[PDB]
Design an enzyme around this catalytic site. Structure first.
Site, short mmCIF file in Angstrom:
data_model
loop_
_atom_site.label_atom_id
_atom_site.label_comp_id
_atom_site.label_asym_id
_atom_site.label_seq_id
_atom_site.Cartn_x
_atom_site.Cartn_y
_atom_site.Cartn_z
N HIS A 13 0.84 -1.19 0.00
CA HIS A 13 0.00 0.00 0.00
C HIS A 13 0.88 1.25 0.00
CE1 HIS A 13 1.11 0.50 4.18
NE2 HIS A 13 0.82 -0.78 4.36
N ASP A 302 3.93 -4.53 3.36
CA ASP A 302 5.36 -4.81 3.31
C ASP A 302 5.64 -6.23 3.79
OD1 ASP A 302 4.68 -4.19 5.96
OD2 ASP A 302 5.87 -2.31 5.95
#
Length: 409
Positions: A13, A302
């Site tokens: 994101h 991540d």
């Protein structure tokens, strides 16, 4: 050269506000943490803009490679599946807005936003469990020793983080001094790994975990174009690399450790591989992909990227991006076909915006200002040529070997 046949982008994101501001995070600095314009963990408007810029680069690049025609693709050509989080859904939408502006593409995602998406968090979802002993053992093997090694291995970054925080003047430090302790930031507490009883969560606490979070926050502040990053105490590329090495080390230990990575990343790896070769009914192909699918965009975190990296032995460093899994950065899987002999290859690249490209919200394009695009070597793969190409059949075997079968969905 070769013909780009299909792409899967596992994207983090975009720039988000910190998901959590713990008492510890407050207590380790006497200074005030700058506030964010959105709720905790949400993509900022600037985050969205940056992802859209990145989507425009992807569009530029994939059109230049002939993978996308000019004009509007449809859901048949480009599929964006995001995790349920607002930050990932809007990242996927921002990606579609940038790659296909005016094309009406809509990000997709698990309809129940109230529950974890097992594609992105199979362990959280309970698809498979982490064993506490195996997890501790795997992380120590990954590290090369017990977590107490971290204070030595990362002594300079830890000291640097203490300086950036002005830890010596912090309430945490005064509490440590109250207890007769020194304010050695690296050792302000033990690094502890905790697997909860059901085996659905693994937590790191202590200086590495905190420093990983704080370094990421500074980077997010910087990426957000905040005017005061780290109270102006963090400047210089190497200082950024050094400080974020704590974050990258934390992600290496907690997300790249193969045992963890394979349990958390197996659905995504299977989704990536099956979408990439477009084996639409293969195990782990969970999306209603069209036979014409050219790009699958996965809007993740991540940790997802790091899990995939851990599963495939991917290790990289990003020029001008000290976070190995930077905001909006994508682990991009490219299916290439050599027209001369029809041999097919998989290329893995980390597509990312540099620090400056984020902070300055720079327009990305092919000729003036491309996103960074770091080829990534894959364990067991041919890693042939400067772009580390893997023969497709080799990549498929590597994926088949890397997945934890108990973790598929």
């Amino acid at each position: 050269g070769y013909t780009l046949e299909r792409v899967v982008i596992l994207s983090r994101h975009g720039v988000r506000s910190p998901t959590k501001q713990t008492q510890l995070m407050n207590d380790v600095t006497p200074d005030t943490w700058p506030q964010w314009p959105v709720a905790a963990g949400e993509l900022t408007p600037r985050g969205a803009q940056l992802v859209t810029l990145m989507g425009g680069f992807y569009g530029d690049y994939f059109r230049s490679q002939g993978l996308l025609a000019a004009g509007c693709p449809t859901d048949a050509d480009i599929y964006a599946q995001a995790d349920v989080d607002q930050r990932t859904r809007l990242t996927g939408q921002a990606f579609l807005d940038g790659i296909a502006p005016g094309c009406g593409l809509k990000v997709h995602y698990q309809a129940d936003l109230k529950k974890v998406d097992p594609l992105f968090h199979p362990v959280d979802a309970g698809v498979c469990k982490l064993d506490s002993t195996q997890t501790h053992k795997a992380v120590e093997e990954r590290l090369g020793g017990p977590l107490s090694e971290l204070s030595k291995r990362y002594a300079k970054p830890f000291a640097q983080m203490g300086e950036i925080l002005n830890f010596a003047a912090s309430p945490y430090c005064k509490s440590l001094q109250q207890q007769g302790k020194t304010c050695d930031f690296a050792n302000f507490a033990a690094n502890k790994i905790t697997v909860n009883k059901p085996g659905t969560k693994v937590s790191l606490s202590g200086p590495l975990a905190l420093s990983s979070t704080l370094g990421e926050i500074f980077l997010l502040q910087n990426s957000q174009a905040m005017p005061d990053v780290a109270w102006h105490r963090l400047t210089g590329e190497d200082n950024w690399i050094s400080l974020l090495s704590l974050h990258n080390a934390q992600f290496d230990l907690m997300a790249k450790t193969p045992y963890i990575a394979r349990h958390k990343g197996t659905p995504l790896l299977q989704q990536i591989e099956t979408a990439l070769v477009l084996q639409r009914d293969a195990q782990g192909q969970t999306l209603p992909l069209s036979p014409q699918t050219k790009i699958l965009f996965l809007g993740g975190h991540d940790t997802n990227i790091a899990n995939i990296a851990g599963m495939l032995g991917l290790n990289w460093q990003l020029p001008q991006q000290p976070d190995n899994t930077p905001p909006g950065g994508g682990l991009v899987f490219e299916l290439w076909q050599n027209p001369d002999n029809h041999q097919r290859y998989v290329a893995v690249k980390l597509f990312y915006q540099t620090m400056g490209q984020l902070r300055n919200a720079e327009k990305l394009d092919l000729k003036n200002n491309p996103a960074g695009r770091v080829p990534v070597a894959i364990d067991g793969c041919e890693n042939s040529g400067d772009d580390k190409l893997c023969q497709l059949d080799t990549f498929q075997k590597k994926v088949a070997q890397a997945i934890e079968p108990a973790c598929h969905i």
